Amino acid sequence: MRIILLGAPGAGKGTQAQFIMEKYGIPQISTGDMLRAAVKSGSELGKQAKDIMDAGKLVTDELVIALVKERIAQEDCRNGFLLDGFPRTIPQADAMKEAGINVDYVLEFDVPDELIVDRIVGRRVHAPSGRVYHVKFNPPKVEGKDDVTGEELTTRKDDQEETVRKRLVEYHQMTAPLIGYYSKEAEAGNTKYAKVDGTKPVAEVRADLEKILG
Ligand SMILES: Nc1ncnc2c1ncn2[C@@H]1O[C@H](COP(=O)(O)OP(=O)(O)O)[C@@H](O)[C@H]1O
Ligand SMILES: Nc1ncnc2c1ncn2[C@@H]1O[C@H](COP(=O)(O)OP(=O)(O)O)[C@@H](O)[C@H]1O
Ligand code: NA
């Protein structure tokens, strides 16, 4: 199974990606996680992203297409994969088309803009895994600790309110057009498309996605 998650920043995509990875046995491919890891490690492919992410802007198409091509070539993607944060522009989606990378589901997470800041400012992450929590809305079992490893959670450098506002503007200009892009693909029979209400509690969104993925 191959799945794309679409939605504004803070819509819940990374939260739900974890459940889909676990239940369907496919890896999550998160360009944000890969970029943050490349900055942290000083990796030649991606360390360049540091100041751009800090600005709330998208990284160039060529850099993330290369990160995704490298990641998806790996053995763990043989049986499918979930794309979380990619594609993020029409040229990224067209690069997938040109590579012959068909997908089975495109899942759009709908959340009103007015909920985004208060979600992201409360976000806490386990950087090695990508697991995400929220200090009020979805807290870890033990404060500041990853439920799975017990390691100390961190706060992303790009999650302050003003940076979130900039990322939401960028999303609306550059990334929202992918809704129509994939709706058109679905009408051609090349994927399924489904929209979920991302305002429901975490477990209810998970159940709605299970109804769709079968
Ligand atoms: N259904 C939900 N209700 C309330 N908060 C949520 C929900 N889903 C995720 N969150 C929290 O909102 C923040 C954003 O979610 P995240 O999954 O990181 O979004 P995305 O990957 O779409 O940017 C995180 O702190 C997360 O714990
Ligand atoms: N596919 C992509 N194309 C361009 N930039 C990206 C891409 N994926 C991630 N980024 C960069 O990483 C940042 C964080 O993205 P992400 O981790 O997906 O956060 P959020 O879930 O809050 O949108 C973006 O603001 C952008 O700088
Ligand atoms: Na398909």
For residue 52 and ligand 2, the question of a CB distance below 6 A is answered with yes
The 3-class secondary structure across the chain, one letter per residue, is CEEEEECCCCCCHHHHHHHHHHHHCCCEECHHHHHHHHHHHCCCCCHHHHHHHHCCCCCCHHHHHHHHHHHHCCHHHCCCEEEECCCCCHHHHHHHHHCCCCCCEEEEEECCHHHHHHHHHCEEECCCCCCEEECCCECCCCCCECCCCCCECECCCCCCHHHHHHHHHHHHHHHCHHHHHHHHHHHCCCCEEEEEECCCCHHHHHHHHHHHHC
Distance CA 195, CA 206 (A): 13
The one catalytic residue among 88, 124, 131, 206 = 88
Closest ligand 1 atom to the C-alpha of 16? Answer: 17
Comparing CA positions, the residue from 190, 187, 208, 186 lying closest to residue 199 is 208
Distance CA 118, CA 121 (A): 5
Other CB atoms within 10 A of residue 27 CB: 16
Other CB atoms within 10 A of residue 24 CB: 14
Distance CA 101, CA 95 (A): 9
- Name beta bridge partners: 82: 3, 28
Comparing CA positions, the residue from 98, 72, 74, 58 lying closest to residue 2 is 72
Omega cis (within 30) before 87: yes
Write the CA distances from 141 to 99, 179, 204, integer angstroms. Answer: 42, 35, 19
Does the annotation flag 167 for ligand binding?
yes
Does the annotation flag 7 for ligand binding?
no
The dihedral built from the CA positions of residue 128, 131, 133 and 139, taken in this order, carries a sign that is: negative
For residue 13 and ligand 1, the question of a CB distance below 6 A is answered with yes
Is 71 one of the annotated active-site residues of the chain? no
Other CB atoms within 10 A of residue 111 CB: 19
Q: Give every CB contact of residue 202 below 8 A, 6+ residues apart in sequence.
A: 12, 15, 16, 138
Q: Give every CB contact of residue 12 below 8 A, 6+ residues apart in sequence.
A: 109, 111, 198, 202, 205
The dihedral built from the CA positions of residue 59, 61, 63 and 68, taken in this order, carries a sign that is: positive
Comparing CA positions, the residue from 101, 107, 104, 71 lying closest to residue 2 is 104
Distance CA 164, CA 145 (A): 24
For residue 158, how many C-alpha atoms fall within 13 Å in the half-sphere facing its CB? 21
Domain boundary assignment for the chain: 1-214
The dihedral built from the CA positions of residue 28, 164, 173 and 8, taken in this order, carries a sign that is: positive
Can you give the C-alpha Rg of the chain in angstroms?
16
Distance CA 37, CA 58 (A): 16
The backbone torsions φ and ψ at residue 58, rounded to the nearest 5 degrees and listed phi first, read: -75, 145
Is 167 one of the annotated active-site residues of the chain? yes
By the CB criterion, residues less than 5 angstroms from ion ligand 3 are: 102, 191
Q: Give every CB contact of residue 47 below 8 A, 6+ residues apart in sequence.
A: 38, 39, 41
Comparing CA positions, the residue from 120, 37, 117 lying closest to residue 71 is 37
User: How many residues can be counted in the chain?
Assistant: 214
What technique determined this structure? X-ray
Distance CA 159, CA 165 (A): 10
- CA-nearest residue, atom 12 of ligand 1: 119
